[PDB]
From Swiss-Prot, chain A:
The gene is ssuE. PANTHER family: FMN REDUCTASE (NADPH) (PTHR43408:SF1). InterPro entries: Flavoprotein-like_sf (IPR029039), FMN_Rdtase-like_dom (IPR005025), NAD(P)H-dep_FMN_reductase (IPR051814), NADPH-dep_FMN_reduc_SsuE (IPR020048). SUPFAM superfamilies: Flavoproteins (SSF52218). Keywords: Flavoprotein, FMN, NADP, Oxidoreductase. This is FMN reductase (NADPH).
Length: 175, 173
């Protein structure tokens, strides 16, 4: 089993990337090979001006083709996913998530926003032909206690992340 | 009256940017001051990395403050507005469109996709507190004949554009 993790935050490090470093620890223990990407791995001109001959884009698309699932994480901006994340999603092949399980993580100031962000992501991930979109998981900015070093999360948040990642693994393993 | 036009296609020129060039022509003939922007007027690293010090962002936010209305155009990617357009909307102040009229425009391949971009875009403009979001012009790519030179549209798209721009001018007063 191989998994892609993608941080969609405009900053690095971020709350988004700290959630994915926690996920990679767990997935390392479950003998899942993880390819981890953030938006700062790409040339900004290639994202903003939608240039498909980016080197990194080819390597990302190759690793996505080999992946059984995707954990994608985004800050909540204007009641939706980040535009920074969407610039990369817009560069992927038309059926890039076919065959794959997707776990979406969202970070922000209030969980009241999760439903709107789930609803914004659904058509995009469905356009990419995701095989299985898991329910979105919200992490409150106040519960991500430190994101510059090894992640520190409140214990409620850890348990909720562990639970969602176990659902994700079971979803992959079933397939 | 002052109007901002904002092209969201990562390519300039594009089918959807051609709509704003016609819009700018039409509005200028009604004696509107039009400030026209596209994504080439910003440093991509400022948009992608959310750099609120960006000088071009500051200029844009100042001009938008003073505008009575916004016309925003996007292509349809992955059943939504372009990520590139959204990187800029994400850097605007939380109530940036309050008291303002917005005319959304979009071009895409299918009817399902014109519907999807409409459902995607309006909540973002609502989050920004737009006072009134017009119905909009959602055109099939084939409706744009020429998007270099002076833009050329099908008669049916020409008429929908003219009608929506008059509605927009009225809404400004």
């Amino acid at each position: 089993m191989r998994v892609i993790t993608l941080a969609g935050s405009p900053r690095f490090p971020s709350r988004s990337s700290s959630l994915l470093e926690y996920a990679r620890e767990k997935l390392n223990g479950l003998d899942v090979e993880v390819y981890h990407w953030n938006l700062q791995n790409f040339a900004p001109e290639d994202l903003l001006y939608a240039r498909f001959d980016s080197p990194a884009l080819k390597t990302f698309t190759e690793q996505l083709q080999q992946a059984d699932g995707l954990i994608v994480a985004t800050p909540v901006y204007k009641a939706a996913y980040s535009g920074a994340l969407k610039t990369l999603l817009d560069l992927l092949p038309e059926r890039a998530l076919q065959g794959k399980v997707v776990l979406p993580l969202a970070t922000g100031g209030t969980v009241a926003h999760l439903l709107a962000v789930d609803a914004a992501l659904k058509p995009v991930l469905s356009a990419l032909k995701a095989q299985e979109i898991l329910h979105g998981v919200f992490a409150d900015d106040s519960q991500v206690i430190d994101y510059h070093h090894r992640p520190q999360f409140t214990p409620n948040l850890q348990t909720r992340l562990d639970t969602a990642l176990e659902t994700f693994w079971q979803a992959l393993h079933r397939r």
